[PDB]
From a paper:
Y16A/I20A/L25A/F28A-HNP1 forms a dimer which is very similar to the Y16A/F28A-HNP1 dimer (the average RMSDs between 60 equivalent Cα-atoms of 0.4 Å). Solvent-accessible surface buried due to Y16A/I20A/L25A/F28A-HNP1 and Y16A/F28A-HNP1 dimer formation corresponds to 490 and 495 Å2 per monomer, respectively, indicating that these dimers are energetically indistinguishable. Surprisingly, although Y16A/I20A/L25A/F28A-HNP1 has mutated Ile20 and Leu25 that were previously identified as essential for wild type tetramer formation, analysis of intermolecular contacts within the crystal indicates that Y16A/I20A/L25A/F28A-HNP1 dimers arrange into a tetramer resembling closely the wild-type tetramer architecture. Replacement of Ile20 and Leu25 side chains at the tetramer interface by less ‘bulky’ side chains of Ala allows Y16A/I20A/L25A/F28A-HNP1 dimers to pack more tightly together. The buried interface area for Y16A/I20A/L25A/F28A-HNP1 tetramer formation is 1450 Å2 per dimer as compared to 1140 Å2 buried at the wild type HNP1 tetramer interface. In addition, the canonical dimer formed by the quadruple mutant displayed a larger interface than wild-type. HNP1 bound to immobilized HNP1 with a 20-fold greater response at 8000 nM than Y16A/I20A/L25A/F28A-HNP1 bound to HNP1, and HNP1 bound to immobilized gp120 with an 8-fold greater response at 8000 nM than Y16A/I20A/L25A/F28A-HNP1 bound to gp120. All HNP1 analogs except Y16A/I20A/L25A/F28A-HNP1 bound N36 in a dose-dependent fashion, reflected by increasing fluorescence polarization values with the increase in defensin concentration. However, the inhibitory activity of Y16A/F28A and Y16A/I20A/L25A/F28A in particular was greatly suppressed with the latter yielding an IC50 95-fold higher than that of wild type HNP1. Notably, Y16A/I20A/L25A/F28A-HNP1 barely showed any activity at the maximum tested concentration of 256 µg/mL against S. aureus, whereas its activity remained less than vLD99.9 against E. coli and its vLD99.9 against B. cereus was 11-fold higher than HNP1.
Numbering used by the authors:
A (entry chain B), B (entry chain D), C (entry chain E), D (entry chain A): 1 to 30
Write the structure that this text describes.
């Protein structure tokens, strides 16, 4: 599936949404 | 539906999930 | 703050993120 | 960080939040 990162997705991935945990918003990278 | 708040939902509401925007995680209050 | 809707935000609002509750992804409308 | 799954996290992981993408809510597993 998809992995949560900040500040943005890395090479090979593309951003498809967000995650929410530990108080912040993360990019969901798929 | 549901309204995003921090740090928590108010009287009359119940927490049902999360929101993610402006870099942070908010409670979704229903 | 912001209100969760599907399929999209209404006039007067702008989409700023997502909400997650009851199993689905909602627009966070601010 | 954390990986998005449905319906729930697997052994070795803990649920810390949610992900939102492709229209659905996923568990964020850390």
């Amino acid at each position: 599936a998809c992995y949560c990162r900040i500040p943005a997705c890395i090479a090979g991935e593309r951003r498809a949404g967000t995650c929410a945990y530990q108080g912040r918003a993360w990019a969901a990278c798929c």
